[PDB]
Design an enzyme around this catalytic site. Sequence first.
Site, PDB file in Angstrom:
ATOM      1  N   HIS A 150      59.135  -2.261 -36.371  1.00 53.10           N
ATOM      2  CA  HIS A 150      58.476  -1.058 -35.880  1.00 53.10           C
ATOM      3  C   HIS A 150      57.038  -1.371 -35.483  1.00 53.10           C
ATOM      4  O   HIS A 150      56.213  -1.745 -36.316  1.00 53.10           O
ATOM      5  CB  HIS A 150      58.536   0.046 -36.932  1.00 53.10           C
ATOM      6  CG  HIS A 150      59.910   0.611 -37.121  1.00 53.10           C
ATOM      7  ND1 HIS A 150      60.983  -0.162 -37.509  1.00 53.10           N
ATOM      8  CD2 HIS A 150      60.393   1.864 -36.947  1.00 53.10           C
ATOM      9  CE1 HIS A 150      62.066   0.594 -37.580  1.00 53.10           C
ATOM     10  NE2 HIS A 150      61.734   1.827 -37.244  1.00 53.10           N
ATOM     11  N   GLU A 177      68.022  -0.445 -29.512  1.00 54.43           N
ATOM     12  CA  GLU A 177      69.059  -1.293 -30.078  1.00 54.43           C
ATOM     13  C   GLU A 177      70.260  -1.494 -29.162  1.00 54.43           C
ATOM     14  O   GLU A 177      71.112  -2.331 -29.473  1.00 54.43           O
ATOM     15  CB  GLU A 177      69.522  -0.720 -31.425  1.00 54.43           C
ATOM     16  CG  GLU A 177      68.426  -0.798 -32.484  1.00 54.43           C
ATOM     17  CD  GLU A 177      68.672   0.110 -33.666  1.00 54.43           C
ATOM     18  OE1 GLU A 177      68.307  -0.276 -34.799  1.00 54.43           O
ATOM     19  OE2 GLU A 177      69.225   1.209 -33.461  1.00 54.43           O
ATOM     20  N   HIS A 232      65.902  -9.491 -38.175  1.00 58.52           N
ATOM     21  CA  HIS A 232      66.210  -9.456 -39.600  1.00 58.52           C
ATOM     22  C   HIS A 232      67.549  -8.791 -39.891  1.00 58.52           C
ATOM     23  O   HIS A 232      68.155  -9.076 -40.930  1.00 58.52           O
ATOM     24  CB  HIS A 232      65.099  -8.735 -40.362  1.00 58.52           C
ATOM     25  CG  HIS A 232      64.818  -7.350 -39.865  1.00 58.52           C
ATOM     26  ND1 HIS A 232      64.187  -7.103 -38.665  1.00 58.52           N
ATOM     27  CD2 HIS A 232      65.074  -6.139 -40.412  1.00 58.52           C
ATOM     28  CE1 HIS A 232      64.071  -5.798 -38.491  1.00 58.52           C
ATOM     29  NE2 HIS A 232      64.601  -5.191 -39.536  1.00 58.52           N
ATOM     30  N   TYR A 278      61.573  -4.104 -29.199  1.00 57.80           N
ATOM     31  CA  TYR A 278      60.359  -3.313 -29.023  1.00 57.80           C
ATOM     32  C   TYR A 278      59.668  -3.784 -27.753  1.00 57.80           C
ATOM     33  O   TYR A 278      59.316  -4.963 -27.641  1.00 57.80           O
ATOM     34  CB  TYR A 278      59.426  -3.464 -30.227  1.00 57.80           C
ATOM     35  CG  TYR A 278      60.093  -3.175 -31.546  1.00 57.80           C
ATOM     36  CD1 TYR A 278      60.785  -4.167 -32.227  1.00 57.80           C
ATOM     37  CD2 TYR A 278      60.041  -1.907 -32.108  1.00 57.80           C
ATOM     38  CE1 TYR A 278      61.407  -3.902 -33.438  1.00 57.80           C
ATOM     39  CE2 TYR A 278      60.656  -1.635 -33.314  1.00 57.80           C
ATOM     40  CZ  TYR A 278      61.331  -2.633 -33.978  1.00 57.80           C
ATOM     41  OH  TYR A 278      61.951  -2.348 -35.177  1.00 57.80           O
TER      42      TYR A 278
HETATM   43 CU   LIG Z   1      60.895  -2.087 -37.636  1.00 56.72          CU
END
Ligand SMILES: [Cu+2]
Length: 223
Positions: A1, A30, A157, A168
Amino acid sequence: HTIFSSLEVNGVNQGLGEGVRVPTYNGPIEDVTSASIACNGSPNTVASTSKVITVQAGTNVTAIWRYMLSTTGDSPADVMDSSHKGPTIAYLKKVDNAATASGVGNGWFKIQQDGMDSSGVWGTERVINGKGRHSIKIPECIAPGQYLLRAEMIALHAASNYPGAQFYMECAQLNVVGGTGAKTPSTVSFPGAYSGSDPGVKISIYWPPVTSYTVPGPSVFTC
Ligand SMILES: [Cu+2]
Ligand SMILES: *[C@@H]1O[C@H](CO)[C@@H](O[C@@H]2O[C@H](CO)[C@@H](O[C@H]3O[C@H](CO[C@H]4O[C@H](CO)[C@@H](O)[C@H](O[C@H]5O[C@H](CO)[C@@H](O)[C@H](O)[C@@H]5O)[C@@H]4O)[C@@H](O)[C@H](O[C@H]4O[C@H](CO)[C@@H](O)[C@H](O)[C@@H]4O[C@H]4O[C@H](CO)[C@@H](O)[C@H](O)[C@@H]4O)[C@@H]3O)[C@H](O)[C@H]2NC(C)=O)[C@H](O)[C@H]1NC(C)=O
């Protein structure tokens, strides 16, 4: 984020959300084939901006990554959670008007990427621990004029399956001046350049240990 929320050019920060189309929500995209993959978008809300930033071809711009639009610091907690290991990438797209062009579709070429190095340290970690600074060389040999700059961090991750990887990205609005136009790069489409089966998208970064990482997208363009 995290959010690419401002751009630094020639040692001058151009302002929060000024010349960068920023969302208020720092949540990832995503679906790699969503139209939102290009310059972010739904289910996020992306603000428009009328500023087009002048940059001399051949020089660098620095994307400034922050956790939220209200973030004041430049420490790791002010950039992105340290669990978000993955590559950093940047693209350019020649457009007729950088303040209004959508960015969806053909025309993107890669100008920077930072995957995983021989020490197992990832590009996002260099940005997280480097004051959120994501330095990007604007090629000297491309045509001058209006471009969108797509700067991206991918967190892997949770990427052992697809969907899982977290993308992002935000687009800055540039006026490249001094470009020689001697080289025209081969281009790809966003969406389209990434696939949910890419070795750099669906990947377990924990087991087995990653020996080499393949950044998604085309190879970097260089003058
Ligand atoms: Cu995040
Ligand atoms: C304008 O923009 C451009 C980019 O558009 C800027 O150029 C980049 O500048 C950065 C920062 O200076 C520079 O960072 C890396 O530099 C080394 C890269 O080594 C390359 O060649 C290797 C050939 O042996 C190759 O293996 C590397 O590729 C591996 O790693 C990359 C990711 O880095 C993968 O994507 C790739 O697949 C492959 O796996 C590179 O191609 C690199 O050594 C640097 O890492 C050290 O320092 C980091 C920061 O501390 C640290 O995180 C990392 O672990 C490593 O630390 C270790 O060594 C340190 C001393 O070297 C020391 O602190 C310790 O001993 C540590 O153990 C760094 O990641 C990019 O390479 C530049 N890119 C290009 C294309 O030139 C430019 O600066 C910018 N500004 C201008 C021009 O003013």
